Scaffold this active site. Structure first.
Site, PDB file in Angstrom:
ATOM      1  N   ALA A  49       0.837  -1.200   0.000  1.00 43.63           N
ATOM      2  CA  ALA A  49       0.000   0.000   0.000  1.00 43.63           C
ATOM      3  C   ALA A  49       0.875   1.255   0.000  1.00 43.63           C
ATOM      4  CB  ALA A  49      -0.949  -0.017   1.191  1.00 43.63           C
ATOM      5  N   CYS A  51      -4.570  -3.866 -10.506  1.00 43.65           N
ATOM      6  CA  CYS A  51      -5.050  -2.836 -11.426  1.00 43.65           C
ATOM      7  C   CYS A  51      -4.727  -3.224 -12.871  1.00 43.65           C
ATOM      8  CB  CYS A  51      -4.446  -1.484 -11.064  1.00 43.65           C
ATOM      9  SG  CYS A  51      -5.451  -0.066 -11.560  1.00 43.65           S
TER      10      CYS A  51
END
EC number: 2.1.1.310
Lengths: 35, 86, 305, 174
Positions: free
Chosen positions: C116, C233
RNA sequence: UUGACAUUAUUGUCAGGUGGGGAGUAAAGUUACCACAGGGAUAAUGGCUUGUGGCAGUCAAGCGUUCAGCGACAUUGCUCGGCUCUUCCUAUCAUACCGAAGCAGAAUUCGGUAA
C-alpha cells in the site's frame, strides 16, 4: 592563534576554492564530452 | 533562467516566473528529426550544486525529457532551451 | 483473416501488437479500440474528521462542482486549498476503493498490508476502523515511505505502522492471524492511459518474472495470516483469475469467497474446441470504458484452516 | 530504538509545557487507551501501548514511523516539535489564535501572523506563549511563538506582527 | 511478541522476529540551503552604439605533421507620465524633384536627393 592566520590566508583560501571549483567544472565537462 | 509552497529551506532568492520554462528543444544526433518536449527534471547543472537544487538551465546542464539530454545553448541570452539527446 | 482492423489499432494508437493480442479473445471486434477510448477525478472524504455531507457543501463555497461516485459508497465525490492539508479528504481514484470495499474491516482487529505505497487504502481502512486497532503498512520503495507517513499524519489515522522489507519475509516477522491486503502487483497494468510508458516498454520477461513473483506474494500473504483479499489494477488474465489458481492449488486452507458487490464483470464461458476457462468465475473485473473506474480486479478469500 | 528515558520525558513535557499548561497530565492519565512514547534515531512518536508492543518485532533500520510523530531531539540536546504533533495539541490547547479566511494563505506559506487580523484572541495570553490557529472550522493550521500580549496586540497598528510562525500544515504541500 | 504442543478454563515447553536494557569480548563526522554573529577585497565609451537567433547536418576560399582540428554565405527540424518656449541631428509624416510596382485614370507601396 587562528583568526590572524585566517585573515592572512583569506585571499589564498578564496583563490584555492575558485580554482578547485573551476577544475571540477572542467573535469565534469570533459567527462561529458568524452562520450 | 531556471526550471520548475514547494520551496522549503530557500532564503530570499525569489525567482520570477518569467524565468521558468517547461519545454525545451530536443534534437537527436543520430536522427534528422527534432521534437519539442516538456522538461522533466534537471540532473546535474554545472558551476554549482545550488544551481542543480534550484533547477537552473545554464549551458551544459544535463536534463531528462519525456520520450537523457544536455542543454547546449544559453537560455538566458536567447529565451530558448536547446538540448541534444545523450 | 481481416487483420486490417487489428492494424488500425496499432497504427492510430501506436500500440504494440504483442500486448494488443491479449485483448481479442472472443471479445467485440473493436474491444481493444473501445478499451483505448477511455485510456475522471475522484476525491475520498475523510470520515474521521468531517462527514461527506459537510464536505458536500463546504467545497461548493468556492464554486467546485461535485457529484456522487457511482453507487458503491457516498464517501467519495466526483467532479492546495487548506481543506486538502486539513486531512478532510484525500485525492483517490474510485478504483482504489474496491480493495477496501472487499476488505471490510472489523473494529479492534489488526490489518496487515503489503504494497500500500500510496497510503490511500490504509487511510480508508483506518477511517473504517475509526482509528481503532492496528493497521500495518509495507512498501519496497523506500523513497515512497515519505508519502505514507505524510498522508497518515495529515489524515490522523494514529493507528498505522510503516515498515520497509520484502513482503515474502512478513510471515516470519509477526504473522498475525488476521486479514491481509494485496493490491496492484501486475506488470500488464490497467490505467495505462495514464502510464504512457507501457505502450512500448514491455517484454515477455516481465510476464515471466513479475506474475511468478506476485504468485509467491499470495502464498506469503496467507502465511502471514483471516480474510484474504487480492486485487490488481489490470484486466489481463495473467494478473488475475490465473495467479490465484496457483495459491488455491498449493494451499487448501484458503477458500474462495464472494469478492464484492454486484458491480463488475465475470469470467468468460468457453472457446469452441480450442481453449477453456478455470473455475474462478466468481472473480470480478472492471474496464476503463464500460465503467468509470479503470481496469481493475478484485478477489476475496477466507482461511478456513 | 528504545523506550523514552524518564529524563527525556521531562524535556518532552517542558517543550509541551509551552502550548499546554499542567493539563498535559490529562494526555496520559485517561487510561481508556494506554499510550507510550518511543524514539527512533532522535525522532520521537506518540503511540498507543498495545500497538507499540508488537512494533518491536520490526528491526529499527526498517521502521520509518510509528503512531503519530511528535518531534525529534536535536544534535545539541534540545527538542523541536513538528507539524505532525498539531493533531494531538488540539485536544489540550491552552492558548489559541486565529487568522482571517482571506489571509490564511500567507500563514500556510510560513509567513508570520500580522495584526491586520483583529478579533477576540484568548485573553491572558503571555507575550511569548505559543498559540494555535483555526480558519471558520476549528481546524488546526499551525503553531508558533507569540509576539505581543492580548492588550498590546489589540492596541497596535495593523502592520505589527502578533505571533512568530514556526510550523504550519503547509509542510504537506510537497 | 507471532505460531505449535498438553491439562476443567489455564499454566508451562518448543519454534521464530526484535533487542546501546543487562552480561561477556554510542556519539564523531558529513552539508554549496548550512541560518544567526566574526572577519578579507570588490561594486559605484578600451571610438562604445543599430536590420536579419538560438542547438543540431550536409554543401566548404585555407589553415590542422602531407591538411589531429576548425570554419563564411544560403539551406533544414520543431521554436514616472506628460507640461511648456528656444537651438540642433537625420535614422523624412507632409511640401519639391526622380526611379521602380498589373503604374488603364484616380488613388496607392517602396526606394534616392532633401531638415
Amino acid at each position: 592563534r587562528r583568526q590572524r592566520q585566517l585573515k592572512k590566508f583569506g585571499k589564498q583560501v578564496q583563490n584555492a576554492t575558485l580554482q578547485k571549483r573551476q577544475l571540477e567544472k572542467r573535469e565534469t565537462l570533459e567527462k561529458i564530452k568524452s562520450l | 533562467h531556471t526550471f520548475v509552497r514547494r520551496p522549503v529551506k530557500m532564503e530570499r532568492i525569489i525567482r520570477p516566473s518569467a524565468l521558468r520554462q517547461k519545454k525545451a528543444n530536443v534534437t537527436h544526433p543520430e536522427l534528422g528529426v527534432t521534437v519539442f518536449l516538456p522538461i522533466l527534471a534537471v540532473k546535474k547543472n554545472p558551476q554549482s550544486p545550488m544551481y542543480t537544487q534550484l533547477g537552473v538551465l545554464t549551458k551544459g546542464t544535463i536534463i531528462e525529457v519525456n520520450v537523457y539530454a544536455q542543454v547546449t545553448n544559453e537560455p538566458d541570452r536567447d529565451g530558448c532551451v536547446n538540448a541534444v539527446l545523450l | 483473416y481481416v487483420d486490417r482492423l487489428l492494424k488500425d489499432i496499432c497504427e492510430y494508437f501506436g500500440y504494440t501488437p504483442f500486448l494488443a493480442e491479449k485483448l481479442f479473445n472472443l471479445f467485440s471486434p473493436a474491444e481493444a479500440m473501445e478499451f483505448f477510448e477511455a485510456n475522471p477525478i475522484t476525491i475520498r472524504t475523510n470520515t474521521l474528521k468531517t462527514r461527506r455531507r459537510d464536505l458536500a457543501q463546504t467545497l461548493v463555497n468556492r464554486g467546485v462542482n461535485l457529484q456522487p461516485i457511482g453507487s458503491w459508497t457516498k464517501v467519495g465525490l466526483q467532479i492546495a486549498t487548506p481543506e486538502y492539508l486539513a486531512g478532510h479528504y484525500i485525492l483517490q481514484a474510485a478504483s482504489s476503493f474496491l480493495p477496501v470495499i472487499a476488505l471490510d474491516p472489523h473494529e479492534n482487529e489488526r490489518i496487515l498490508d503489503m504494497a500500500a505505497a500510496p497510503g490511500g487504502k490504509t487511510t480508508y481502512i483506518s477511517a473504517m476502523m475509526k482509528n481503532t486497532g492496528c493497521v500495518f503498512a509495507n512498501d519496497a520503495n523506500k523513497s515512497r515511505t515519505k508519502s505514507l507517513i505524510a498522508n497518515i499524519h495529515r489524515l490522523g489515522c494514529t493507528n498505522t505502522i510503516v515498515c520497509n522489507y520484502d513482503a515474502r519475509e512478513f510471515p516470519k516477522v509477526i504473522g498475525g492471524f488476521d486479514r491481509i491486503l494485496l493490491d496492484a502487483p501486475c506488470s500488464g497494468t490497467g490505467v495505462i492511459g495514464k502510464d504512457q510508458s507501457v505502450k512500448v516498454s514491455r517484454t515477455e520477461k516481465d510476464f515471466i518474472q513479475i506474475p511468478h513473483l506476485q504468485k509467491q506474494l499470495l502464498l506469503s500473504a496467507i502465511d502471514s495470516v483471516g480474510v484474504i483479499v487480492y486485487s490488481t489494477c489490470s484486466v489481463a488474465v495473467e494478473e488475475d483469475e490465473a495467479v490465484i489458481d496457483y495459491a488455491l492449488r498449493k494451499r487448501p486452507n484458503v477458500k474462495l469467497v464472494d469478492t464484492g458487490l454486484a458491480i463488475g464483470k465475470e469470467a468468460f464461458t468457453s472457446y469452441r474446441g480450442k481453449k477453456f476457462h478455470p473455475s474462478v468465475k466468481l472473480a470480478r473485473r472492471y474496464y476503463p470504458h464500460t465503467y468509470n473506474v479503470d481496469g481493475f480486479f478484485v478477489a476475496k478469500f477466507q482461511k478456513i484452516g | 530504538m528504545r523506550q523514552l528515558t524518564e529524563e527525556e520525558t521531562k524535556v518532552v513535557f517542558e517543550k509541551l509545557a509551552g502550548y499546554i499548561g499542567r493539563n498535559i497530565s490529562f494526555l496520559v492519565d485517561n487510561k481508556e487507551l494506554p499510550h507510550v512514547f518511543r524514539l527512533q534515531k532522535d525522532r520521537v512518536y506518540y503511540v498507543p501501548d498495545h500497538v507499540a508492543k508488537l512494533a518491536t518485532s520490526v528491526a529499527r533500520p526498517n521502521l520509518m514511523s510509528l503512531g503519530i510523530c511528535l518531534g525529534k531531539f536535536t544534535k545539541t540536546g534540545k527538542f523541536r516539535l513538528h507539524i505532525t504533533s498539531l493533531t494531538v495539541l488540539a485536544k489540550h490547547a491552552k492558548y489559541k489564535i486565529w487568522i482571517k479566511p482571506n489571509g490564511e494563505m500567507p500563514f500556510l506559506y510560513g509567513n508570520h501572523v500580522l495584526k491586520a487580523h483583529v478579533g477576540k484572541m484568548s485573553d491572558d495570553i503571555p507575550e511569548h506563549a505559543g498559540v494555535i490557529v483555526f480558519a471558520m472550522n476549528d481546524v488546526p493550521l499551525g503553531f508558533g511563538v507569540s509576539a505581543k500580549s492580548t492588550s498590546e496586540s489589540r492596541n497596535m497598528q495593523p502592520t505589527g506582527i502578533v505571533a512568530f510562525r514556526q510550523a504550519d500544515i503547509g509542510e504537506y504541500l510537497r
